[PDB]
Amino acid sequence: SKLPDLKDAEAVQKFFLEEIQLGEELLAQGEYEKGVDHLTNAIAVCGQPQQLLQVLQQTLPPPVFQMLLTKLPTISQRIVSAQSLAEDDVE
């Protein structure tokens, strides 16, 4: 592709429906995980009160729960380093 732009289609809705599927099969509890997938498609927008909770609270459940206590700062610090590099690029 040349000069791509952010766009939505039913495919992302159906790929959002496979994230629901991963959550539900992984947790044997569809209702709670359905909320955590709505919390991953809503980071595509990054809504003001819901812009930081999103991807982290998603990356929590799918593997064994409670094994992400240490990896969560790893993801957060790598994101912080990413913004540090972006801030350097802006400067």
mmCIF file with all atom_site columns, C-alpha atoms in Angstrom:
data_model
loop_
_atom_site.group_PDB
_atom_site.id
_atom_site.type_symbol
_atom_site.label_atom_id
_atom_site.label_alt_id
_atom_site.label_comp_id
_atom_site.label_asym_id
_atom_site.label_entity_id
_atom_site.label_seq_id
_atom_site.pdbx_PDB_ins_code
_atom_site.Cartn_x
_atom_site.Cartn_y
_atom_site.Cartn_z
_atom_site.occupancy
_atom_site.B_iso_or_equiv
_atom_site.pdbx_formal_charge
_atom_site.auth_seq_id
_atom_site.auth_comp_id
_atom_site.auth_asym_id
_atom_site.auth_atom_id
_atom_site.pdbx_PDB_model_num
ATOM 1  C CA . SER A 1 1  ? 0.000   0.000   0.000  1.00 0.00 ? 1  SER A CA 1
ATOM 2  C CA . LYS A 1 2  ? 1.048   3.595   -0.696 1.00 0.00 ? 2  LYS A CA 1
ATOM 3  C CA . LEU A 1 3  ? 0.153   6.358   1.775  1.00 0.00 ? 3  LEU A CA 1
ATOM 4  C CA . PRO A 1 4  ? -2.131  4.330   4.090  1.00 0.00 ? 4  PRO A CA 1
ATOM 5  C CA . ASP A 1 5  ? -4.810  5.912   6.285  1.00 0.00 ? 5  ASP A CA 1
ATOM 6  C CA . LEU A 1 6  ? -6.622  4.694   9.399  1.00 0.00 ? 6  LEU A CA 1
ATOM 7  C CA . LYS A 1 7  ? -9.997  3.210   8.455  1.00 0.00 ? 7  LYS A CA 1
ATOM 8  C CA . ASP A 1 8  ? -12.602 0.830   9.862  1.00 0.00 ? 8  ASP A CA 1
ATOM 9  C CA . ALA A 1 9  ? -14.642 -1.997  8.340  1.00 0.00 ? 9  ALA A CA 1
ATOM 10 C CA . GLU A 1 10 ? -16.699 -5.013  9.380  1.00 0.00 ? 10 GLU A CA 1
ATOM 11 C CA . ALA A 1 11 ? -13.456 -7.005  9.256  1.00 0.00 ? 11 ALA A CA 1
ATOM 12 C CA . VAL A 1 12 ? -12.150 -5.234  12.372 1.00 0.00 ? 12 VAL A CA 1
ATOM 13 C CA . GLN A 1 13 ? -15.590 -5.903  13.980 1.00 0.00 ? 13 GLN A CA 1
ATOM 14 C CA . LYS A 1 14 ? -15.088 -9.629  13.085 1.00 0.00 ? 14 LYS A CA 1
ATOM 15 C CA . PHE A 1 15 ? -11.408 -9.485  14.317 1.00 0.00 ? 15 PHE A CA 1
ATOM 16 C CA . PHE A 1 16 ? -12.847 -7.779  17.455 1.00 0.00 ? 16 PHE A CA 1
ATOM 17 C CA . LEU A 1 17 ? -15.253 -10.793 17.571 1.00 0.00 ? 17 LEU A CA 1
ATOM 18 C CA . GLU A 1 18 ? -12.199 -13.160 17.589 1.00 0.00 ? 18 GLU A CA 1
ATOM 19 C CA . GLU A 1 19 ? -10.699 -11.229 20.499 1.00 0.00 ? 19 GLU A CA 1
ATOM 20 C CA . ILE A 1 20 ? -13.969 -11.897 22.307 1.00 0.00 ? 20 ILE A CA 1
ATOM 21 C CA . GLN A 1 21 ? -13.516 -15.536 21.340 1.00 0.00 ? 21 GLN A CA 1
ATOM 22 C CA . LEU A 1 22 ? -9.954  -15.686 22.706 1.00 0.00 ? 22 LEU A CA 1
ATOM 23 C CA . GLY A 1 23 ? -11.077 -14.122 25.960 1.00 0.00 ? 23 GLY A CA 1
ATOM 24 C CA . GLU A 1 24 ? -14.061 -16.403 26.436 1.00 0.00 ? 24 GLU A CA 1
ATOM 25 C CA . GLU A 1 25 ? -12.244 -19.630 25.661 1.00 0.00 ? 25 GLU A CA 1
ATOM 26 C CA . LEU A 1 26 ? -9.335  -18.538 27.822 1.00 0.00 ? 26 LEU A CA 1
ATOM 27 C CA . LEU A 1 27 ? -11.366 -17.572 30.901 1.00 0.00 ? 27 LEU A CA 1
ATOM 28 C CA . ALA A 1 28 ? -14.372 -19.922 30.609 1.00 0.00 ? 28 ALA A CA 1
ATOM 29 C CA . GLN A 1 29 ? -16.406 -16.739 31.487 1.00 0.00 ? 29 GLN A CA 1
ATOM 30 C CA . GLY A 1 30 ? -17.704 -14.798 28.393 1.00 0.00 ? 30 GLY A CA 1
ATOM 31 C CA . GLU A 1 31 ? -19.380 -11.764 30.108 1.00 0.00 ? 31 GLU A CA 1
ATOM 32 C CA . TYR A 1 32 ? -16.273 -10.342 31.932 1.00 0.00 ? 32 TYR A CA 1
ATOM 33 C CA . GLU A 1 33 ? -13.837 -10.866 28.987 1.00 0.00 ? 33 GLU A CA 1
ATOM 34 C CA . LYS A 1 34 ? -16.427 -9.340  26.573 1.00 0.00 ? 34 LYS A CA 1
ATOM 35 C CA . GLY A 1 35 ? -15.880 -6.114  28.589 1.00 0.00 ? 35 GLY A CA 1
ATOM 36 C CA . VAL A 1 36 ? -12.020 -6.380  28.304 1.00 0.00 ? 36 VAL A CA 1
ATOM 37 C CA . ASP A 1 37 ? -12.213 -6.725  24.454 1.00 0.00 ? 37 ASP A CA 1
ATOM 38 C CA . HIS A 1 38 ? -14.509 -3.630  24.267 1.00 0.00 ? 38 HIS A CA 1
ATOM 39 C CA . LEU A 1 39 ? -11.552 -2.128  26.260 1.00 0.00 ? 39 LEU A CA 1
ATOM 40 C CA . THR A 1 40 ? -9.104  -2.950  23.339 1.00 0.00 ? 40 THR A CA 1
ATOM 41 C CA . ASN A 1 41 ? -11.202 -1.680  20.326 1.00 0.00 ? 41 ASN A CA 1
ATOM 42 C CA . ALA A 1 42 ? -11.884 1.495   22.437 1.00 0.00 ? 42 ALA A CA 1
ATOM 43 C CA . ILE A 1 43 ? -8.034  2.212   22.562 1.00 0.00 ? 43 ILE A CA 1
ATOM 44 C CA . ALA A 1 44 ? -8.131  2.576   18.723 1.00 0.00 ? 44 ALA A CA 1
ATOM 45 C CA . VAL A 1 45 ? -9.952  5.835   19.775 1.00 0.00 ? 45 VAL A CA 1
ATOM 46 C CA . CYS A 1 46 ? -8.119  6.251   23.184 1.00 0.00 ? 46 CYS A CA 1
ATOM 47 C CA . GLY A 1 47 ? -11.114 8.046   24.874 1.00 0.00 ? 47 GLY A CA 1
ATOM 48 C CA . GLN A 1 48 ? -10.147 10.724  27.518 1.00 0.00 ? 48 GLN A CA 1
ATOM 49 C CA . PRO A 1 49 ? -11.115 8.834   30.796 1.00 0.00 ? 49 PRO A CA 1
ATOM 50 C CA . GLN A 1 50 ? -10.407 5.522   29.074 1.00 0.00 ? 50 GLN A CA 1
ATOM 51 C CA . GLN A 1 51 ? -7.073  6.109   27.279 1.00 0.00 ? 51 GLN A CA 1
ATOM 52 C CA . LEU A 1 52 ? -4.554  4.433   29.572 1.00 0.00 ? 52 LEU A CA 1
ATOM 53 C CA . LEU A 1 53 ? -6.494  1.639   31.288 1.00 0.00 ? 53 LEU A CA 1
ATOM 54 C CA . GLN A 1 54 ? -7.316  0.019   27.983 1.00 0.00 ? 54 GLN A CA 1
ATOM 55 C CA . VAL A 1 55 ? -4.503  -2.074  26.490 1.00 0.00 ? 55 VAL A CA 1
ATOM 56 C CA . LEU A 1 56 ? -3.031  -2.907  29.884 1.00 0.00 ? 56 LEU A CA 1
ATOM 57 C CA . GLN A 1 57 ? -6.291  -4.260  31.287 1.00 0.00 ? 57 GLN A CA 1
ATOM 58 C CA . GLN A 1 58 ? -6.584  -6.235  28.055 1.00 0.00 ? 58 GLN A CA 1
ATOM 59 C CA . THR A 1 59 ? -3.073  -7.670  28.201 1.00 0.00 ? 59 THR A CA 1
ATOM 60 C CA . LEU A 1 60 ? -3.918  -8.907  31.696 1.00 0.00 ? 60 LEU A CA 1
ATOM 61 C CA . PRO A 1 61 ? -6.466  -11.771 31.286 1.00 0.00 ? 61 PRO A CA 1
ATOM 62 C CA . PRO A 1 62 ? -5.649  -13.894 28.169 1.00 0.00 ? 62 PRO A CA 1
ATOM 63 C CA . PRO A 1 63 ? -2.546  -15.825 29.441 1.00 0.00 ? 63 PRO A CA 1
ATOM 64 C CA . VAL A 1 64 ? -2.577  -17.337 32.966 1.00 0.00 ? 64 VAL A CA 1
ATOM 65 C CA . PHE A 1 65 ? -4.086  -14.559 35.160 1.00 0.00 ? 65 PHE A CA 1
ATOM 66 C CA . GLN A 1 66 ? -1.801  -13.006 37.886 1.00 0.00 ? 66 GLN A CA 1
ATOM 67 C CA . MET A 1 67 ? 1.406   -13.936 35.955 1.00 0.00 ? 67 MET A CA 1
ATOM 68 C CA . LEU A 1 68 ? 1.415   -10.401 34.440 1.00 0.00 ? 68 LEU A CA 1
ATOM 69 C CA . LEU A 1 69 ? 2.206   -8.566  37.729 1.00 0.00 ? 69 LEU A CA 1
ATOM 70 C CA . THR A 1 70 ? 5.883   -8.110  36.664 1.00 0.00 ? 70 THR A CA 1
ATOM 71 C CA . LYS A 1 71 ? 5.414   -7.968  32.859 1.00 0.00 ? 71 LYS A CA 1
ATOM 72 C CA . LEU A 1 72 ? 2.899   -5.147  33.209 1.00 0.00 ? 72 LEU A CA 1
ATOM 73 C CA . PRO A 1 73 ? 5.618   -2.683  34.285 1.00 0.00 ? 73 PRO A CA 1
ATOM 74 C CA . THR A 1 74 ? 7.732   -4.101  31.454 1.00 0.00 ? 74 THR A CA 1
ATOM 75 C CA . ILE A 1 75 ? 5.066   -3.166  28.913 1.00 0.00 ? 75 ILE A CA 1
ATOM 76 C CA . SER A 1 76 ? 4.486   0.181   30.628 1.00 0.00 ? 76 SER A CA 1
ATOM 77 C CA . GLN A 1 77 ? 8.199   1.031   30.743 1.00 0.00 ? 77 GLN A CA 1
ATOM 78 C CA . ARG A 1 78 ? 8.709   0.025   27.129 1.00 0.00 ? 78 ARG A CA 1
ATOM 79 C CA . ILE A 1 79 ? 5.791   2.323   26.244 1.00 0.00 ? 79 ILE A CA 1
ATOM 80 C CA . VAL A 1 80 ? 7.377   5.059   28.360 1.00 0.00 ? 80 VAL A CA 1
ATOM 81 C CA . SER A 1 81 ? 10.667  4.556   26.512 1.00 0.00 ? 81 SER A CA 1
ATOM 82 C CA . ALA A 1 82 ? 8.765   4.713   23.224 1.00 0.00 ? 82 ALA A CA 1
ATOM 83 C CA . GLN A 1 83 ? 7.242   8.072   24.133 1.00 0.00 ? 83 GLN A CA 1
ATOM 84 C CA . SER A 1 84 ? 10.689  9.263   25.416 1.00 0.00 ? 84 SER A CA 1
ATOM 85 C CA . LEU A 1 85 ? 12.124  8.532   21.898 1.00 0.00 ? 85 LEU A CA 1
ATOM 86 C CA . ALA A 1 86 ? 9.036   10.219  20.294 1.00 0.00 ? 86 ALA A CA 1
ATOM 87 C CA . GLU A 1 87 ? 9.583   13.305  22.559 1.00 0.00 ? 87 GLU A CA 1
ATOM 88 C CA . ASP A 1 88 ? 13.274  13.348  21.443 1.00 0.00 ? 88 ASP A CA 1
ATOM 89 C CA . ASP A 1 89 ? 12.070  13.197  17.770 1.00 0.00 ? 89 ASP A CA 1
ATOM 90 C CA . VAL A 1 90 ? 9.649   16.137  18.486 1.00 0.00 ? 90 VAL A CA 1
ATOM 91 C CA . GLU A 1 91 ? 12.560  18.134  20.076 1.00 0.00 ? 91 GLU A CA 1
#
